[PDB]
Amino acid sequence: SRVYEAYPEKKATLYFLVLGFLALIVGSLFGPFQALNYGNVDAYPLLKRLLPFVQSYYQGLTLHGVLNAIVFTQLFAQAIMVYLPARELNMRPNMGLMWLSWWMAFIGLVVFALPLLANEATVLYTFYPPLKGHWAFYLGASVFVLSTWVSIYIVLDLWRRWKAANPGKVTPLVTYMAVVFWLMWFLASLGLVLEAVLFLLPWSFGLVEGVDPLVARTLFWWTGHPIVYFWLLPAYAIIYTILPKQAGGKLVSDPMARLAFLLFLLLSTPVGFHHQFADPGIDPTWKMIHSVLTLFVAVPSLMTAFTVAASLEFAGRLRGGRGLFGWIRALPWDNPAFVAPVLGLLGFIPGGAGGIVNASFTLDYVVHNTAWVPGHFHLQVASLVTLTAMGSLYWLLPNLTGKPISDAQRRLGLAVVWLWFLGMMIMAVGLHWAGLLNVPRRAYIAQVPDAYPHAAVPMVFNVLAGIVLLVALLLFIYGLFSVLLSRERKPELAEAPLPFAEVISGPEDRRLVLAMDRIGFWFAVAAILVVLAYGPTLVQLFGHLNPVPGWRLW
Amino acid sequence: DEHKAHKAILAYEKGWLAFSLAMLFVFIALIAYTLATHTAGVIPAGKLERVDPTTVRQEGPWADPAQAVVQTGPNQYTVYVLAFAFGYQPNPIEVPQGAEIVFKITSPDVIHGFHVEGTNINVEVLPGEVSTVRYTFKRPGEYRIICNQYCGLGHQNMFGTIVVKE
Amino acid sequence: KPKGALAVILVLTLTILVFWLGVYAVFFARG
Ligand code: HAS
Ligand code: HEM
Ligand SMILES: CCCCCCCC/C=C\CCCCCCCC(=O)OC[C@H](O)CO
Ligand SMILES: CCCCCCCC/C=C\CCCCCCCC(=O)OC[C@H](O)CO
Ligand SMILES: CCCCCCCC/C=C\CCCCCCCC(=O)OC[C@H](O)CO
Ligand SMILES: CCCCCCCC/C=C\CCCCCCCC(=O)OC[C@H](O)CO
Ligand SMILES: CCCCCCCC/C=C\CCCCCCCC(=O)OC[C@H](O)CO
Ligand SMILES: CCCCCCCC/C=C\CCCCCCCC(=O)OC[C@H](O)CO
Ligand SMILES: CCCCCCCC/C=C\CCCCCCCC(=O)OC[C@H](O)CO
Ligand SMILES: CCCCCCCC/C=C\CCCCCCCC(=O)OC[C@H](O)CO
Ligand SMILES: CCCCCCCC/C=C\CCCCCCCC(=O)OC[C@H](O)CO
Ligand code: CUA
Ligand SMILES: [O-][O-]
Ligand SMILES: [Cu+2]
């Protein structure tokens, strides 16, 4: 293919996407079984007949969380947030590095997958000590995540090469998004890298006898919060810069888009004590500080809600929609690339609402470690992020492969997207309601069928969701493979421009865009904020370490 | 048209952002209120209290569950609770209604949850550390303790009991 | 004026408030 010769970045981008979607398929297989469990129905006997290596509910849950929430999301982020800026700038990524990043992720995955599949690391995707997994789990995971440091280098390189050729020009929008995104991730990632290098790796290798569980969780959640914004922002890049064109309109504000991303750079990392409201040994004053800063990290999404809604409204009016509801009806509801992110955004309304509750310190005692939490995060990552990625396939896949989407494949995609969305909404109802009734998360409750009688009603929603999502998943597998294994190839589809939206420009503040483009400065502010939010606590913890022995309770 | 739409969009967006900020600020004030009331007793103590998980069942206040409830004030009791694979001691925990209860909870093995159904007591229990929370039971009767942190294959049936006496 | 975008942020506000005040009430009930 002469296309891959001129744009080798298409092939590497394709490899990230396909590996990501494969991980999603494998992790998601466990989903309907888990939803049935939360409906008090035990279908694990059936699962074990189909997949005999599966030893427990909790091994399945480990696979589900790792493959869906760590692997799929990272690989999608590495595809989108390298390829989009590269195409905007019309520049080639360092291809040696791009391929290195892919191989690191692939090898890392293989290495941690072995112990997971062998029942040697049934510790969940948070892997809290003293539960002690096989060394290959921690090593494989470390290599997998470090793949992203290469991606950070790649994009910083593109940006600096472009700035060298264009002195005194402001960073283009998509590239601005990606630069602040990748710099945020670098700062974010240090918690886990520190946790792995200082504690988990030496411990799992048998170099040290124990690990201090409090310091391990604190370092974990330094990364564990911003990682969710790492998952979200690739979807946001698409929603701001591509969706308005798919809708038939334009992005209504470039500056407001940049501002949202800048706030994410500053506020994504210094907030992790909101995962530790119920932990001993962390001062309540510091919990309150993180609670306040978490309420602040909500502001960029509150901003996104308006900027995006106004852009969709503008599109709908351009297409002839009148009145208060006509603009909605006039949008292109026959296009899965439009429909998927929009449905995801609708579910993000209650998803965001639950997040704000979680952040509220004392209110977290009502919901912490209950089913409410999975209800919240399925709305955010399993619906918005995942749907945006599925929809992407209807424009991104042809661009990378030259393979056309037939009218029949388009209609099947609409069905998948709607069932996936609806199943997630139904399950969210079942989980939030069960959570309010004190049903714990991370629990094979179908094996204690008389323990939660008050939850009988929401349990019905969970069974229904498990069924709906099974159907959506089966249709997705069929659909993805029908595209990936189809004969036809139209090279003009691979040579077409990406559907980037035009922007409505106004007198505005060119000064605000200039101010926001002071990236080196904003990165320093972000780093300082982390030092101020984490430093005092971590000094105390490191001076009073109490390592304890590891356990295998599976 | 496009210039006019743009102007109107930015004008109303600024109004929305001020409102949303106001709303978040009101939540912060409502949280601060909780922090000044007796309901804040369930927030774990911030001070580090280290213990050795390998000797907690042999020496010290968790070694004899029948002596776990200690009167520490005129209307105050301290209760030394062990959360372990897969249960809680003592079982039941027996306390008087209307008294301030100071729970001091640790684990000899892995992390457990300590979630008292019907109350705001919801605290992580870490081996090597003492989790200290406070609560006054206004209603007598039986309260279930649920383990809400995955602790291995016994997690889903890990429960305990608090009995509040009249 | 962007009446549609305003309708969306109205739904968002009402949802946030119902969630937050709802849980606040539960917190006090369990206190
Ligand atoms: C991608 C995934 C995730 C995002 C995003 C996310 C956002 C938030 N979360 Fe969260 N969350 C918490 C707080 C928040 C807050 C304040 C927000 C905020 O960033 C949310 C702000 C969002 C909004 C305010 C919504 C804006 C609405 C929009 C943008 C839609 C507009 C609609 C349109 C435009 C459509 C109109 C179109 C038409 C056609 C009409 C807290 C603590 O404060 C905990 C710990 C709880 C505990 O006890 O363990 C927590 C736990 C989780 C966990 C569990 C971790 C574990 O395993 O223990 C995950 C995975 C998760 C993921 C995610 N979370 N969250
Ligand atoms: C077929 C769709 C899916 C269904 C039916 C499903 C269902 C479930 C259920 C019922 C739980 C709670 C289990 C428990 O607390 O014991 C769960 C956990 C989880 N889900 Fe999903 N899910 C699906 C898709 C996804 C996807 C796409 C994501 C990520 C992109 C995701 C990420 C997670 C995470 C991170 C956990 C928590 C794991 C842990 O606590 O260790 N889910 N899901
Ligand atoms: C228990 C919870 C389960 C219920 C969950 C349901 C959530 C709301 C569903 C859809 C909202 C979508 C609103 C927009 C509808 C678009 C259809 C439309 O306007 O179509 C025009 C026509 O097709 C010409 O294209
Ligand atoms: C367009 C996007 C969609 C966004 C919209 C979806 C958000 C749903 C929000 C609230 C529903 C909750 C219903 C409130 C239920 C109240 C609970 C109740 O009545 O409980 C009585 C209790 O037993 C007394 O003790
Ligand atoms: C196109 C057709 C649309 C279909 C949409 C259906 C409408 C939603 C209502 C119920 C779902 C029923 C699924 C629940 C399966 C049985 C629930 C169960 O396990 O029963 C609990 C009962 O309380 C034990 O005592
Ligand atoms: C397109 C995908 C959406 C499809 C969604 C359709 C869901 C099925 C709805 C109704 C049939 C339910 C009738 C069967 C009810 C039997 C209940 C049952 O067997 O429950 C277990 C029982 O509690 C053991 O003790
Ligand atoms: C936490 C409580 C204490 C801390 C207080 C934090 C609250 C202040 C936040 C933002 C100020 C908003 C200032 C924004 C003004 C910039 C003007 C602008 O950009 O608009 C000009 C427009 O484009 C042409 O008319
Ligand atoms: C339980 C009851 C709950 C109800 C709670 C109320 C919800 C308020 C919602 C949105 C406010 C949006 C901000 C409104 C915009 C401000 C006006 C503005 O900026 O418009 C001036 C413009 O320049 C003229 O051309
Ligand atoms: C320009 C307009 C400015 C006016 C806007 C003002 C915001 C009003 C909202 C909340 C006030 C907070 C009320 C604090 C009282 C809390 C009492 C409470 O909730 O009591 C709980 C329980 O019953 C006993 O502990
Ligand atoms: C759509 C979602 C709708 C969801 C509907 C909302 C469900 C919340 C219900 C109750 C929470 C309040 C708990 C109040 C605690 C009292 C329990 C109690 O008294 O039990 C303890 C003890 O055992 C007695 O002696
Ligand atoms: C459509 C998909 C989105 C999923 C939607 C999730 C549903 C949760 C909604 C609202 C939570 C509000 C809290 C409900 C509690 C209200 C009970 C109340 O009013 O509390 C007083 C009572 O005395 C206490 O014991
Ligand atoms: Cu102890 Cu779960
Ligand atoms: O993590 O929200
Ligand atoms: Cu977080």
Residue numbers in the entry:
A (entry chain A): 9 to 562
B (entry chain B): 3 to 168
C (entry chain C): 4 to 34
Authors' own words:
Heme/copper oxidases (HCO) represent a superfamily of enzymes found in the aerobic respiratory chain of mitochondria and bacteria that convert oxygen to water and transfer protons across membranes to form an electrochemical gradient.
The wild type (WT) protein and A120F mutant of ba3 cytochrome c oxidase from T. thermophilus were crystallized in lipidic cubic phase and their structures were refined at 1.8 Å. By itself, this mutation has no effect on the oxidase activity of the mutant form (data not shown), suggesting that the two entrances are redundant and the enzyme can fully function with one of them blocked. Overall, 20 monoolein molecules were modeled in the asymmetric unit. The asymmetric unit of the current model of ba3-oxidase contains 225 water molecules, of which 53 are buried inside the protein. However, a major difference at the active site of the new structure of ba3, compared to previous structures, is the modeling of a peroxide ion bridging the iron of heme-a3 and CuB. Refinement was performed in several ways, modeling: (i) a single water, (ii) two waters with partial occupancy, (iii) two O-atoms separated by a fixed distance of 1.47 Å, and (iv) two unrestrained O-atoms.
